[PDB]
Structure formats: structure tokens, C-alpha cells
mmCIF file of all heavy atoms in Angstrom:
data_model
loop_
_atom_site.group_PDB
_atom_site.id
_atom_site.type_symbol
_atom_site.label_atom_id
_atom_site.label_comp_id
_atom_site.label_asym_id
_atom_site.label_seq_id
_atom_site.Cartn_x
_atom_site.Cartn_y
_atom_site.Cartn_z
ATOM 1 N N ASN A 84 22.424 -4.311 -23.510
ATOM 2 C CA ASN A 84 22.393 -5.537 -22.730
ATOM 3 C C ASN A 84 21.618 -5.375 -21.430
ATOM 4 O O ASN A 84 21.968 -5.997 -20.421
ATOM 5 C CB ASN A 84 23.816 -6.020 -22.459
ATOM 6 C CG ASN A 84 24.533 -6.439 -23.729
ATOM 7 O OD1 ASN A 84 24.526 -7.610 -24.101
ATOM 8 N ND2 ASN A 84 25.148 -5.476 -24.405
ATOM 9 N N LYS A 85 20.574 -4.554 -21.435
ATOM 10 C CA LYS A 85 19.714 -4.383 -20.278
ATOM 11 C C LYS A 85 18.264 -4.758 -20.534
ATOM 12 O O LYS A 85 17.597 -5.235 -19.615
ATOM 13 C CB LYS A 85 19.768 -2.934 -19.781
ATOM 14 C CG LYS A 85 19.652 -2.806 -18.278
ATOM 15 C CD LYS A 85 19.649 -1.351 -17.849
ATOM 16 C CE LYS A 85 19.552 -1.235 -16.341
ATOM 17 N NZ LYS A 85 18.572 -2.208 -15.785
ATOM 18 N N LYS A 86 17.758 -4.558 -21.749
ATOM 19 C CA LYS A 86 16.394 -4.954 -22.079
ATOM 20 C C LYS A 86 16.389 -6.406 -22.544
ATOM 21 O O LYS A 86 17.339 -6.862 -23.189
ATOM 22 C CB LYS A 86 15.807 -4.028 -23.143
ATOM 23 C CG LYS A 86 16.609 -3.939 -24.436
ATOM 24 C CD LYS A 86 16.070 -2.869 -25.383
ATOM 25 C CE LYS A 86 14.557 -2.936 -25.534
ATOM 26 N NZ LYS A 86 14.017 -1.753 -26.262
ATOM 27 N N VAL A 87 15.340 -7.135 -22.195
ATOM 28 C CA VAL A 87 15.260 -8.552 -22.521
ATOM 29 C C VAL A 87 14.591 -8.731 -23.874
ATOM 30 O O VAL A 87 13.759 -7.918 -24.290
ATOM 31 C CB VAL A 87 14.504 -9.317 -21.422
ATOM 32 C CG1 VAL A 87 15.361 -9.424 -20.177
ATOM 33 C CG2 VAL A 87 13.195 -8.626 -21.101
ATOM 34 N N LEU A 88 14.965 -9.800 -24.573
ATOM 35 C CA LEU A 88 14.295 -10.188 -25.806
ATOM 36 C C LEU A 88 13.299 -11.316 -25.578
ATOM 37 O O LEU A 88 12.114 -11.171 -25.890
ATOM 38 C CB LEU A 88 15.323 -10.598 -26.866
ATOM 39 C CG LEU A 88 14.811 -10.655 -28.307
ATOM 40 C CD1 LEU A 88 14.100 -9.364 -28.684
ATOM 41 C CD2 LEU A 88 15.946 -10.943 -29.278
ATOM 42 N N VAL A 89 13.756 -12.442 -25.039
ATOM 43 C CA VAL A 89 12.862 -13.519 -24.623
ATOM 44 C C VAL A 89 13.205 -13.877 -23.183
ATOM 45 O O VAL A 89 14.360 -14.215 -22.889
ATOM 46 C CB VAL A 89 12.970 -14.737 -25.549
ATOM 47 C CG1 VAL A 89 12.355 -15.962 -24.892
ATOM 48 C CG2 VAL A 89 12.282 -14.454 -26.871
ATOM 49 N N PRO A 90 12.252 -13.809 -22.261
ATOM 50 C CA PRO A 90 12.571 -14.040 -20.853
ATOM 51 C C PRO A 90 12.679 -15.523 -20.548
ATOM 52 O O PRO A 90 12.138 -16.384 -21.244
ATOM 53 C CB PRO A 90 11.390 -13.405 -20.124
ATOM 54 C CG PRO A 90 10.251 -13.618 -21.060
ATOM 55 C CD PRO A 90 10.821 -13.523 -22.459
ATOM 56 N N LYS A 91 13.400 -15.811 -19.475
ATOM 57 C CA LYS A 91 13.579 -17.168 -18.984
ATOM 58 C C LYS A 91 12.420 -17.516 -18.066
ATOM 59 O O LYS A 91 12.170 -16.807 -17.087
ATOM 60 C CB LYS A 91 14.901 -17.302 -18.235
ATOM 61 C CG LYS A 91 15.063 -18.614 -17.511
ATOM 62 C CD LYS A 91 16.302 -18.605 -16.648
ATOM 63 C CE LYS A 91 16.386 -19.866 -15.826
ATOM 64 N NZ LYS A 91 17.569 -19.868 -14.930
ATOM 65 N N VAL A 92 11.725 -18.605 -18.374
ATOM 66 C CA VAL A 92 10.714 -19.144 -17.475
ATOM 67 C C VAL A 92 10.657 -20.650 -17.682
ATOM 68 O O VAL A 92 10.806 -21.145 -18.803
ATOM 69 C CB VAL A 92 9.348 -18.442 -17.669
ATOM 70 C CG1 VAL A 92 8.803 -18.638 -19.070
ATOM 71 C CG2 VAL A 92 8.344 -18.880 -16.611
ATOM 72 N N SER A 93 10.514 -21.384 -16.584
ATOM 73 C CA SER A 93 10.464 -22.834 -16.624
ATOM 74 C C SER A 93 9.468 -23.303 -15.578
ATOM 75 O O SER A 93 8.751 -22.505 -14.968
ATOM 76 C CB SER A 93 11.844 -23.446 -16.367
ATOM 77 O OG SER A 93 12.025 -23.666 -14.979
ATOM 78 N N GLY A 94 9.433 -24.611 -15.364
ATOM 79 C CA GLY A 94 8.586 -25.166 -14.336
ATOM 80 C C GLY A 94 9.098 -24.884 -12.943
ATOM 81 O O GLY A 94 8.308 -24.627 -12.033
ATOM 82 N N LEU A 95 10.414 -24.904 -12.755
ATOM 83 C CA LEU A 95 10.940 -24.853 -11.399
ATOM 84 C C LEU A 95 11.218 -23.448 -10.898
ATOM 85 O O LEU A 95 12.003 -23.293 -9.958
ATOM 86 C CB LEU A 95 12.217 -25.678 -11.273
ATOM 87 C CG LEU A 95 12.023 -27.161 -10.965
ATOM 88 C CD1 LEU A 95 11.626 -27.960 -12.196
ATOM 89 C CD2 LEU A 95 13.265 -27.727 -10.300
ATOM 90 N N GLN A 96 10.610 -22.430 -11.485
ATOM 91 C CA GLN A 96 10.703 -21.123 -10.865
ATOM 92 C C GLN A 96 9.451 -20.846 -10.044
ATOM 93 O O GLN A 96 8.342 -21.250 -10.401
ATOM 94 C CB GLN A 96 10.896 -20.035 -11.912
ATOM 95 C CG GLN A 96 11.765 -20.450 -13.071
ATOM 96 C CD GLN A 96 11.864 -19.376 -14.123
ATOM 97 O OE1 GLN A 96 10.996 -18.509 -14.222
ATOM 98 N NE2 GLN A 96 12.934 -19.412 -14.908
ATOM 99 N N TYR A 97 9.651 -20.166 -8.919
ATOM 100 C CA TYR A 97 8.539 -19.760 -8.071
ATOM 101 C C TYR A 97 7.678 -18.742 -8.797
ATOM 102 O O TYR A 97 8.190 -17.798 -9.405
ATOM 103 C CB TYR A 97 9.040 -19.150 -6.764
ATOM 104 C CG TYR A 97 9.599 -20.111 -5.746
ATOM 105 C CD1 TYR A 97 10.779 -20.797 -5.980
ATOM 106 C CD2 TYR A 97 8.962 -20.300 -4.530
ATOM 107 C CE1 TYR A 97 11.295 -21.656 -5.049
ATOM 108 C CE2 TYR A 97 9.471 -21.161 -3.591
ATOM 109 C CZ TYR A 97 10.639 -21.837 -3.857
ATOM 110 O OH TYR A 97 11.159 -22.700 -2.925
ATOM 111 N N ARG A 98 6.371 -18.938 -8.749
ATOM 112 C CA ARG A 98 5.441 -17.953 -9.279
ATOM 113 C C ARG A 98 4.736 -17.261 -8.117
ATOM 114 O O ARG A 98 3.640 -17.627 -7.695
ATOM 115 C CB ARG A 98 4.460 -18.620 -10.232
ATOM 116 C CG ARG A 98 5.128 -19.467 -11.290
ATOM 117 C CD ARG A 98 5.303 -18.687 -12.571
ATOM 118 N NE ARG A 98 6.501 -17.862 -12.531
ATOM 119 C CZ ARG A 98 7.709 -18.297 -12.865
ATOM 120 N NH1 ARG A 98 7.869 -19.547 -13.270
ATOM 121 N NH2 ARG A 98 8.753 -17.483 -12.803
ATOM 122 N N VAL A 99 5.404 -16.243 -7.588
ATOM 123 C CA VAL A 99 4.813 -15.448 -6.518
ATOM 124 C C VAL A 99 3.792 -14.493 -7.138
ATOM 125 O O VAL A 99 4.049 -13.870 -8.173
ATOM 126 C CB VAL A 99 5.886 -14.713 -5.700
ATOM 127 C CG1 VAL A 99 6.817 -13.889 -6.578
ATOM 128 C CG2 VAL A 99 5.255 -13.829 -4.644
ATOM 129 N N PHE A 100 2.600 -14.438 -6.559
ATOM 130 C CA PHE A 100 1.594 -13.506 -7.032
ATOM 131 C C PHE A 100 1.348 -12.420 -5.997
ATOM 132 O O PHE A 100 1.416 -12.642 -4.786
ATOM 133 C CB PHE A 100 0.297 -14.237 -7.357
ATOM 134 C CG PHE A 100 0.359 -15.027 -8.615
ATOM 135 C CD1 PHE A 100 -0.302 -16.235 -8.725
ATOM 136 C CD2 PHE A 100 1.096 -14.569 -9.688
ATOM 137 C CE1 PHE A 100 -0.235 -16.969 -9.889
ATOM 138 C CE2 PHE A 100 1.162 -15.293 -10.853
ATOM 139 C CZ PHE A 100 0.497 -16.496 -10.954
ATOM 140 N N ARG A 101 1.042 -11.227 -6.492
ATOM 141 C CA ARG A 101 0.787 -10.085 -5.621
ATOM 142 C C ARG A 101 -0.405 -9.341 -6.220
ATOM 143 O O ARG A 101 -0.247 -8.492 -7.098
ATOM 144 C CB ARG A 101 2.011 -9.192 -5.501
ATOM 145 C CG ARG A 101 1.891 -8.141 -4.423
ATOM 146 C CD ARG A 101 2.612 -6.863 -4.800
ATOM 147 N NE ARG A 101 2.410 -5.824 -3.798
ATOM 148 C CZ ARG A 101 2.539 -4.526 -4.035
ATOM 149 N NH1 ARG A 101 2.875 -4.102 -5.244
ATOM 150 N NH2 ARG A 101 2.335 -3.654 -3.060
ATOM 151 N N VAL A 102 -1.591 -9.684 -5.742
ATOM 152 C CA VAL A 102 -2.799 -9.061 -6.250
ATOM 153 C C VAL A 102 -3.011 -7.716 -5.570
ATOM 154 O O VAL A 102 -2.419 -7.407 -4.536
ATOM 155 C CB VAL A 102 -4.012 -9.974 -6.042
ATOM 156 C CG1 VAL A 102 -3.865 -11.233 -6.856
ATOM 157 C CG2 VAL A 102 -4.151 -10.300 -4.584
ATOM 158 N N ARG A 103 -3.882 -6.914 -6.158
ATOM 159 C CA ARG A 103 -4.296 -5.658 -5.565
ATOM 160 C C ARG A 103 -5.775 -5.732 -5.232
ATOM 161 O O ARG A 103 -6.550 -6.426 -5.895
ATOM 162 C CB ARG A 103 -4.033 -4.482 -6.504
ATOM 163 C CG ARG A 103 -2.572 -4.149 -6.658
ATOM 164 C CD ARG A 103 -1.990 -3.705 -5.341
ATOM 165 N NE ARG A 103 -0.661 -3.134 -5.507
ATOM 166 C CZ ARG A 103 -0.197 -2.126 -4.782
ATOM 167 N NH1 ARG A 103 -0.957 -1.579 -3.845
ATOM 168 N NH2 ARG A 103 1.024 -1.660 -4.997
ATOM 169 N N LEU A 104 -6.159 -5.015 -4.192
ATOM 170 C CA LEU A 104 -7.542 -4.963 -3.755
ATOM 171 C C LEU A 104 -7.970 -3.511 -3.712
ATOM 172 O O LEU A 104 -7.244 -2.657 -3.194
ATOM 173 C CB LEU A 104 -7.741 -5.592 -2.369
ATOM 174 C CG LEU A 104 -7.819 -7.113 -2.193
ATOM 175 C CD1 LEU A 104 -8.982 -7.688 -2.988
ATOM 176 C CD2 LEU A 104 -6.514 -7.854 -2.496
ATOM 177 N N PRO A 105 -9.135 -3.192 -4.267
ATOM 178 C CA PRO A 105 -9.657 -1.832 -4.134
ATOM 179 C C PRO A 105 -10.069 -1.564 -2.698
ATOM 180 O O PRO A 105 -10.591 -2.439 -2.005
ATOM 181 C CB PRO A 105 -10.863 -1.820 -5.079
ATOM 182 C CG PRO A 105 -11.277 -3.239 -5.161
ATOM 183 C CD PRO A 105 -10.027 -4.054 -5.053
ATOM 184 N N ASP A 106 -9.796 -0.351 -2.250
ATOM 185 C CA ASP A 106 -10.063 0.018 -0.873
ATOM 186 C C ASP A 106 -11.560 0.150 -0.650
ATOM 187 O O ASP A 106 -12.217 0.899 -1.383
ATOM 188 C CB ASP A 106 -9.358 1.319 -0.536
ATOM 189 C CG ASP A 106 -9.326 1.588 0.945
ATOM 190 O OD1 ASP A 106 -10.355 2.026 1.490
ATOM 191 O OD2 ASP A 106 -8.273 1.348 1.569
ATOM 192 N N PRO A 107 -12.133 -0.524 0.340
ATOM 193 C CA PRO A 107 -13.593 -0.587 0.455
ATOM 194 C C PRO A 107 -14.222 0.699 0.952
ATOM 195 O O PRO A 107 -15.438 0.879 0.842
ATOM 196 C CB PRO A 107 -13.803 -1.724 1.457
ATOM 197 C CG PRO A 107 -12.612 -1.645 2.325
ATOM 198 C CD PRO A 107 -11.466 -1.235 1.440
ATOM 199 N N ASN A 108 -13.411 1.602 1.492
ATOM 200 C CA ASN A 108 -13.937 2.870 1.973
ATOM 201 C C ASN A 108 -14.367 3.783 0.841
ATOM 202 O O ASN A 108 -15.197 4.672 1.055
ATOM 203 C CB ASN A 108 -12.897 3.577 2.836
ATOM 204 C CG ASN A 108 -12.265 2.652 3.846
ATOM 205 O OD1 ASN A 108 -12.934 1.798 4.425
ATOM 206 N ND2 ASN A 108 -10.963 2.806 4.052
ATOM 207 N N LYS A 109 -13.831 3.584 -0.356
ATOM 208 C CA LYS A 109 -14.263 4.360 -1.514
ATOM 209 C C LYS A 109 -15.372 3.647 -2.284
ATOM 210 O O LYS A 109 -15.326 3.516 -3.505
ATOM 211 C CB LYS A 109 -13.065 4.648 -2.408
ATOM 212 C CG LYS A 109 -11.923 5.336 -1.680
ATOM 213 C CD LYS A 109 -10.715 5.519 -2.580
ATOM 214 C CE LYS A 109 -9.652 6.374 -1.908
ATOM 215 N NZ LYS A 109 -8.423 6.495 -2.739
ATOM 216 N N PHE A 110 -16.396 3.209 -1.555
ATOM 217 C CA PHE A 110 -17.599 2.614 -2.123
ATOM 218 C C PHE A 110 -18.825 3.374 -1.645
ATOM 219 O O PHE A 110 -19.085 3.445 -0.441
ATOM 220 C CB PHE A 110 -17.737 1.142 -1.734
ATOM 221 C CG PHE A 110 -16.942 0.208 -2.588
ATOM 222 C CD1 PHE A 110 -16.693 -1.084 -2.167
ATOM 223 C CD2 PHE A 110 -16.465 0.611 -3.822
ATOM 224 C CE1 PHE A 110 -15.969 -1.952 -2.955
ATOM 225 C CE2 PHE A 110 -15.739 -0.248 -4.613
ATOM 226 C CZ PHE A 110 -15.491 -1.533 -4.180
ATOM 227 N N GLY A 111 -19.581 3.919 -2.586
ATOM 228 C CA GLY A 111 -20.852 4.506 -2.231
ATOM 229 C C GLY A 111 -21.902 3.427 -2.098
ATOM 230 O O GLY A 111 -22.398 2.906 -3.098
ATOM 231 N N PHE A 112 -22.239 3.075 -0.872
ATOM 232 C CA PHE A 112 -23.229 2.034 -0.679
ATOM 233 C C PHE A 112 -24.636 2.625 -0.697
ATOM 234 O O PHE A 112 -24.842 3.761 -0.269
ATOM 235 C CB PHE A 112 -22.982 1.313 0.637
ATOM 236 C CG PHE A 112 -21.824 0.371 0.588
ATOM 237 C CD1 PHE A 112 -21.099 0.079 1.728
ATOM 238 C CD2 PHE A 112 -21.462 -0.231 -0.606
ATOM 239 C CE1 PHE A 112 -20.033 -0.792 1.680
ATOM 240 C CE2 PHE A 112 -20.398 -1.100 -0.662
ATOM 241 C CZ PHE A 112 -19.682 -1.382 0.483
ATOM 242 N N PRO A 113 -25.616 1.878 -1.216
ATOM 243 C CA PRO A 113 -26.989 2.410 -1.249
ATOM 244 C C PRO A 113 -27.619 2.532 0.123
ATOM 245 O O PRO A 113 -28.390 3.467 0.369
ATOM 246 C CB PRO A 113 -27.730 1.397 -2.130
ATOM 247 C CG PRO A 113 -26.944 0.141 -1.997
ATOM 248 C CD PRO A 113 -25.517 0.573 -1.890
ATOM 249 N N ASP A 114 -27.305 1.614 1.030
ATOM 250 C CA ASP A 114 -27.820 1.634 2.391
ATOM 251 C C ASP A 114 -26.654 1.669 3.371
ATOM 252 O O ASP A 114 -26.104 0.626 3.736
ATOM 253 C CB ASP A 114 -28.752 0.442 2.639
ATOM 254 C CG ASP A 114 -28.195 -0.865 2.104
ATOM 255 O OD1 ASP A 114 -27.139 -0.834 1.440
ATOM 256 O OD2 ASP A 114 -28.813 -1.919 2.354
ATOM 257 N N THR A 115 -26.292 2.875 3.810
ATOM 258 C CA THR A 115 -25.146 3.085 4.685
ATOM 259 C C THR A 115 -25.502 2.969 6.160
ATOM 260 O O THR A 115 -24.817 3.555 7.008
ATOM 261 C CB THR A 115 -24.521 4.449 4.398
ATOM 262 O OG1 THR A 115 -25.403 5.481 4.856
ATOM 263 C CG2 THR A 115 -24.288 4.619 2.911
ATOM 264 N N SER A 116 -26.555 2.227 6.491
ATOM 265 C CA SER A 116 -27.057 2.217 7.856
ATOM 266 C C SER A 116 -26.371 1.193 8.747
ATOM 267 O O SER A 116 -26.552 1.254 9.967
ATOM 268 C CB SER A 116 -28.563 1.968 7.846
ATOM 269 O OG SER A 116 -29.199 2.770 6.866
ATOM 270 N N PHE A 117 -25.596 0.264 8.191
ATOM 271 C CA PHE A 117 -25.021 -0.791 9.012
ATOM 272 C C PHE A 117 -23.745 -0.373 9.730
ATOM 273 O O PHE A 117 -23.238 -1.146 10.550
ATOM 274 C CB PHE A 117 -24.745 -2.049 8.173
ATOM 275 C CG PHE A 117 -23.910 -1.807 6.945
ATOM 276 C CD1 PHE A 117 -22.525 -1.860 7.002
ATOM 277 C CD2 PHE A 117 -24.513 -1.559 5.723
ATOM 278 C CE1 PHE A 117 -21.760 -1.648 5.877
ATOM 279 C CE2 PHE A 117 -23.749 -1.348 4.593
ATOM 280 C CZ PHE A 117 -22.372 -1.393 4.672
ATOM 281 N N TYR A 118 -23.214 0.813 9.448
ATOM 282 C CA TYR A 118 -21.965 1.248 10.058
ATOM 283 C C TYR A 118 -21.891 2.764 10.029
ATOM 284 O O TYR A 118 -22.571 3.405 9.222
ATOM 285 C CB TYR A 118 -20.758 0.647 9.332
ATOM 286 C CG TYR A 118 -20.268 1.483 8.175
ATOM 287 C CD1 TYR A 118 -19.068 2.175 8.259
ATOM 288 C CD2 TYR A 118 -21.003 1.583 6.999
ATOM 289 C CE1 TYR A 118 -18.614 2.940 7.212
ATOM 290 C CE2 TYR A 118 -20.553 2.352 5.946
ATOM 291 C CZ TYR A 118 -19.357 3.028 6.061
ATOM 292 O OH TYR A 118 -18.894 3.797 5.020
ATOM 293 N N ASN A 119 -21.061 3.327 10.890
ATOM 294 C CA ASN A 119 -20.793 4.755 10.856
ATOM 295 C C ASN A 119 -19.372 4.992 10.357
ATOM 296 O O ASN A 119 -18.421 4.483 10.964
ATOM 297 C CB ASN A 119 -20.980 5.361 12.244
ATOM 298 C CG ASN A 119 -20.484 6.791 12.337
ATOM 299 O OD1 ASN A 119 -20.620 7.582 11.403
ATOM 300 N ND2 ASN A 119 -19.906 7.132 13.481
ATOM 301 N N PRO A 120 -19.178 5.761 9.283
ATOM 302 C CA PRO A 120 -17.811 6.032 8.814
ATOM 303 C C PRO A 120 -17.045 7.012 9.680
ATOM 304 O O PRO A 120 -15.837 7.178 9.464
ATOM 305 C CB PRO A 120 -18.030 6.591 7.405
ATOM 306 C CG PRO A 120 -19.394 7.165 7.450
ATOM 307 C CD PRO A 120 -20.190 6.264 8.345
#
């Protein structure tokens, strides 16, 4: 009685979203002249 079979979802539940963003510091840019890391 812990795993779900069919989940409950309707119109009146909040759909909170939580996206992820890749960290921009791990980008090898071709022209790195506009900033100093």
C-alpha cells in the first residue's frame, strides 16, 4: 500500500513546475573575449 497504480490528477490541482537550467560557466565559448572568468 505504498506504490501507486493510477495516480490522482484533476483540473483543480496546482501544477507547480520546477525546471532545471544548465550552468553557463561550463560552456566553451569560441570567442571568450567579452569577459574574464
Side-chain angles (χ1 to χ4, degrees):
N84 294 267
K85 214 183 181 318
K86 57 187 313 170
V87 288
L88 196 51
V89 164
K91 171 188 175 182
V92 62
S93 90
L95 273 78
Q96 323 177 337
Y97 286 67
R98 309 264 83 86
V99 53
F100 286 144
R101 191 213 176 202
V102 295
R103 289 297 191 145
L104 281 300
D106 193 282
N108 313 322
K109 305 176 172 176
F110 278 164
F112 285 152
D114 45 354
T115 70
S116 315
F117 54 88
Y118 88 109
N119 170 37

